Symmetry: C2
Subunit: 104 residues, 2 copies
């Protein structure tokens, strides 16, 4: 029900990001979501945006915007500490299983 750009904007602010980005919602044949550090563009797969539950979208957007905040493409302790401000390890396990069950 909540517009996808409103969700992205809420996450940019809750992550305390103060660098403007571009948001593109488009069909994507190779990915669900991506972030270009060169053009500061967040790309979200249109089908996923229109068909995945809000919590899965939250997790997906957080993944990309945490990379942008910490200026790292890796998923170690700096990434994990940012994600833990939103979802516990057990909550991430449940979301990750739900995303897989939507793909296969």
């Amino acid at each position: 029900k909540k517009d996808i750009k409103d969700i992205v904007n809420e996450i940019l602010i809750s992550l305390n990001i103060n660098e403007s980005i571009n948001i593109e919602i488009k069909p994507m044949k190779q990915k669900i979501a991506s972030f270009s550090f060169k053009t500061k563009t967040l790309r979200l797969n249109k089908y996923v945006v229109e068909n995945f539950d809000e919590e899965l979208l939250h997790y997906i957007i957080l993944h990309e915007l945490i990379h942008f905040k910490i200026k790292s493409i890796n998923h170690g302790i700096k990434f994990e500490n940012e994600l833990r401000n939103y979802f516990s390890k057990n909550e991430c396990d449940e979301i990750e299983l739900k995303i897989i069950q939507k793909l296969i």
Copy 2:
């Protein structure tokens, strides 16, 4: 340093046949590798068709392709679209819960 030679990609049909053998499935299946917008893999009981996303088949490592195909073919073996204890029983002959979480995270992080 010199890059270690990226080993010859196993043909998708060979990955499928190895799983049908290990799962002891002698029912015939159709394999469709096509662009898919909604999923990366599916299985139709109506036509006995394993559907695989074309970009995924051409770019994912063997370990991820094996896991994805194994998931669909376990459903076909147990004659259930669900992930009950009968699904877990077949999957556990291949991977522990921790190993499944690891591979599933690699799949997710190929797409996000």
